[PDB]
Amino acid sequence: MEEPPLLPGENIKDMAKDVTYICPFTGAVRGTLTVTNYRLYFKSMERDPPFVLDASLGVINRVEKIGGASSRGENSYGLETVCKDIRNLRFAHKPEGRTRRSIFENLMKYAFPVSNNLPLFAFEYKEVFPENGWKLYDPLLEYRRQGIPNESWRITKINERYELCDTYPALLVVPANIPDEELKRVASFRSRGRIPVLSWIHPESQATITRCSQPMVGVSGKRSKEDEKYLQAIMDSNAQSHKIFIFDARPSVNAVANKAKGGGYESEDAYQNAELVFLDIHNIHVMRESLRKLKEIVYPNIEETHWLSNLESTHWLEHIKLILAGALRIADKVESGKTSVVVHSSDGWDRTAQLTSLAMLMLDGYYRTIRGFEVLVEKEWLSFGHRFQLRVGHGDKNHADADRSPVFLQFIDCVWQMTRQFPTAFEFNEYFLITILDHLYSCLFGTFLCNSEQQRGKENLPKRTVSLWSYINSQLEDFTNPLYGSYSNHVLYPVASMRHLELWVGYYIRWNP
Numbered sequence: 001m002e003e004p005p006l007l008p009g010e011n012i013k014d015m016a017k018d019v020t021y022i023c024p025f026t027g028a029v030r031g032t033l034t035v036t037n038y039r040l041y042f043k044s045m046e047r048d049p050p051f052v053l054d055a056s057l058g059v060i061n062r063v064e065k066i067g068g069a070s071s072r073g074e075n076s077y078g079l080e081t082v083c084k085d086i087r088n089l090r091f092a093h094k095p096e097g098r099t100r101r102s103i104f105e106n107l108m109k110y111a112f113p114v115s116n117n118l119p120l121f122a123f124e125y126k127e128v129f130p131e132n133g134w135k136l137y138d139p140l141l142e143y144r145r146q147g148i149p150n151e152s153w154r155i156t157k158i159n160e161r162y163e164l165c166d167t168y169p170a171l172l173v174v175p176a177n178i179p180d181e182e183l184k185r186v187a188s189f190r191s192r193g194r195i196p197v198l199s200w201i202h203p204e205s206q207a208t209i210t211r212c213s214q215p216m217v218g219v220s221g222k223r224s225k226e227d228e229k230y231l232q233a234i235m236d237s238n239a240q241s242h243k244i245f246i247f248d249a250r251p252s253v254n255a256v257a258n259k260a261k262g263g264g265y266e267s268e269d270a271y272q273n274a275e276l277v278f279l280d281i282h283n284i285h286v287m288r289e290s291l292r293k294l295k296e297i298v299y300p301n302i303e304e305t306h307w308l309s310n311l312e313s314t315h316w317l318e319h320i321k322l323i324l325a326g327a328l329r330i331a332d333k334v335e336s337g338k339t340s341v342v343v344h345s346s347d348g349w350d351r352t353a354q355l356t357s358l359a360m361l362m363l364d365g366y367y368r369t370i371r372g373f374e375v376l377v378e379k380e381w382l383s384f385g386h387r388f389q390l391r392v393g394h395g396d397k398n399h400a401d402a403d404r405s406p407v408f409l410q411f412i413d414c415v416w417q418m419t420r421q422f423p424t425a426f427e428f429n430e431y432f433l434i435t436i437l438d439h440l441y442s443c444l445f446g447t448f449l450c451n452s453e454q455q456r457g458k459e460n461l462p463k464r465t466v467s468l469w470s471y472i473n474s475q476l477e478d479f480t481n482p483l484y485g486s487y488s489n490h491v492l493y494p495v496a497s498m499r500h501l502e503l504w505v506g507y508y509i510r511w512n513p
């Protein structure tokens with residue numbers, strides 16, 4: 001009865017009878033706690049419908065022991081799982097029941113398989129679907145859709161074996177007149193060899209969106225004649241504007257600080273035909289801290305009296321605002337400015353991925369379809385080396401790792417904001433976005449594992465794991481926006497202000513009924 005449902009490949013690893021779950025909203029409820037290789041399940045027939053708590057082990061970052069027998073209090077002895085999904089779960093065990101240690105140990109083992117030399121559930125998950133999500137994204141075909149390779153832009157195979165840049169995809173689009181040996185020189189000037197490459201091209205103006213990492217200028221004004229020519233080549237392809245725009249996602253202070261560490265930005269002297277703009281979007285450590293502050297004000301209980309000022313102090317929505325405002329500036333420079341833009345950050349993987357993809361969503365209605373959005377994720381995030389496994393910490397017990405940051409979560413939040421402002425512009429619904437966020441942590445699928453395309457290939461995820469798109473695409477009805485259709489040629493111009501943006505209740509505050 002209180003036994004959990006099981007996915008093909010899932011197994012019960014431990015079970016504790018008469019454990020009390022301390023629900024923050026309804027109160028204590030005694031039932032059975034079960035741990036599988038995929039989830040934590042709690043069910044009690046001591047209510048009606050039975051009470052059911054079902055969470056993927058992947059959302060657990062920590063597990064803490066609460067009390068000892070040296071605790072006389074009612075439900076003072078037990079466990080608490082701190083979760084990535086904007087909650088914490090607290091259970092109470094009876095010392096004489098001798099279940100706490102066992103549950104604690106099995107949780108530490110199965111929620112953090114990587115740390116315990118076990119596989120992530122995605123490799124054990126053996127269900128089969130009608131569609132194969134791994135066949136969804138085809139680089140060459142996406143470029144074709146964009147009218148890519150052409151006269152101005154060619155496809156180079158120089159990174160066919162990730163020699164040029166190992167955090168980059170295999171195929172890269174660069175200016176038709178720039179030879180590979182030259183790409184190699186630009187690569188030594190750009191951080192981690194993440195040179196400027198095409199993300200999107202306007203079908204009418206030929207203004208483009210390129211992306212890259214910061215130029216290694218350093219404390220002395222080191223210049224790269226080839227990088228300068230490369231950017232000039234980017235500009236010479238767009239026959240319109242007599243200038244290019246470089247959007248550095250960082251606040252100026254951080255760009256200057258990077259220069260001090262060896263990196264930097266494109267100066268007015270070195271890049272004569274480029275205008276650089278700082279977008280004031282802070283780093284991963286700042287975003288991690290903003291979410292931490294938000295979780296503490298939304299979960300368990302909100303203090304309504306100071307909601308607005310408490311929300312303000314998190315600076316969550318301010319970050320969302322700066323990210324959307326930056327994407328907006330990029331889209332507008334390309335669309336109404338007919339100007340090409342180069343987008344970067346320090347590393348070019350985090351903020352840069354947020355910026356290109358959001359601008360792209362505004363500009364191209366294709367990315368607003370369910371399949372096109374899946375392509376966008378596979379393209380700008382996965383193939384371009386947003387370090388997913390490190391930013392999420394899949395199956396790793398090191399909860400304090402400073403590499404963990406809600407970068408993709410912020411992106412999805414921004415997508416949801418547009419979805420609110422344009423209720424008929426997207427083919428997918430909110431449920432689709434929340435589902436993506438749940439599986440970002442679940443590790444049921446192989447879609448968000450590994451930190452680069454090269455890694456996913458070496459680990460052969462297409463053949464060893466199931467794609468999230470396989471699940472989603474073979475089951476559309478749930479993720480389709482019924483209002484969709486009344487748009488999708490035109491550019492989206494969301495408004496980025498503290499008065500037009502909201503806190504995504506459906507996601508951050510979904511645990512209270």
Ligand SMILES: CCCC(=O)OC[C@H](COP(=O)(O)O[C@@H]1[C@H](O)[C@H](OP(=O)(O)O)[C@@H](O)[C@H](O)[C@H]1O)OC(=O)CCC
Nearest residue numbers: 254257258261263283284345346347348349350351352
């Ligand atoms: C030096 C002592 C203090 C210290 O740790 O400074 C670190 C700074 C980090 O600079 P930041 O831009 O403030 O911070 C970086 C960005 O958040 C980057 O994202 P994105 O792709 O959006 O750029 C993350 O991937 C990096 O892990 C993070 O370090 O980097 C540098 O100074 C230059 C690196 C060559």
